[PDB]
Amino acid sequence: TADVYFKRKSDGKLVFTAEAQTASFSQAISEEKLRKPLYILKSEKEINLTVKNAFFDLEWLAMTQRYEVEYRIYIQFPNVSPSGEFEMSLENGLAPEIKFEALADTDTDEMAVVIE
């Protein structure tokens, strides 16, 4: 029952807050054939995260009319892309669940930082 804080990457503004529900890090090796030389240690690290009850900041909502995630140990995803996949249900819809995937800039080459 830990909380995820969404921040706008540029500034300290809070995009929204939610509770971390499911976090999947299915980071393994990719195809071998398609990619004597010095080892590079290729990888296909992926980090998905889901938040159960996310309420968007009122000031951010008013202003709206790159993102960072802080999962509280403390984990931080400097860059996260929220996947906006909307599906409707016959049962009138009420839990707004937000799914986002961690991204990795080429220069930094790091996706998530977990620190005590």
Partner 1 sequence: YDYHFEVNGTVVRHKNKGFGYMERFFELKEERSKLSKKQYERFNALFNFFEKNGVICMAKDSIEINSLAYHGKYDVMKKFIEEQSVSIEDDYKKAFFLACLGRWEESYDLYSNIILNSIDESNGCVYYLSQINRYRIYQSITQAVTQFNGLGLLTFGRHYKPFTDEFLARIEREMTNFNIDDLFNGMPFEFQKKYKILEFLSDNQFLYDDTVKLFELTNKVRSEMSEGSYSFGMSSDIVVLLRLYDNLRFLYENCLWSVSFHEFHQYIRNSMSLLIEKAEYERTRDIDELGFFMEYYDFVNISRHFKIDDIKNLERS
Binding site for partner 1 (CB under 8 A): 1-2, 6, 15, 19-26, 47-48, 52, 56, 61, 64-65, 67, 82-94, 96, 98, 112, 114
Q: Which is nearer to partner 1, 37 or 93 (CB)?
A: 93
Q: Which is nearer to partner 1, 11 or 38 (CB)?
A: 11
Q: Which is nearer to partner 1, 26 or 37 (CB)?
A: 26
- Tell me the closest approach of the beta carbon of residue 39 to partner 1, in angstroms: 19
- Tell me the closest approach of the beta carbon of residue 36 to partner 1, in angstroms: 29
- HEC string of the chain? CCEEEEEECCCCCEEEEEEEEEEECCCCCCCCCCCCCCCCCCCCCCCEEEECCCEECHHHHHHHCCEEEEECCEEEECCEEEECCCCCCCCCCCCCCEEEEECCCCCCCCCCEEEC
Q: Which is nearer to partner 1, 40 or 88 (CB)?
A: 88
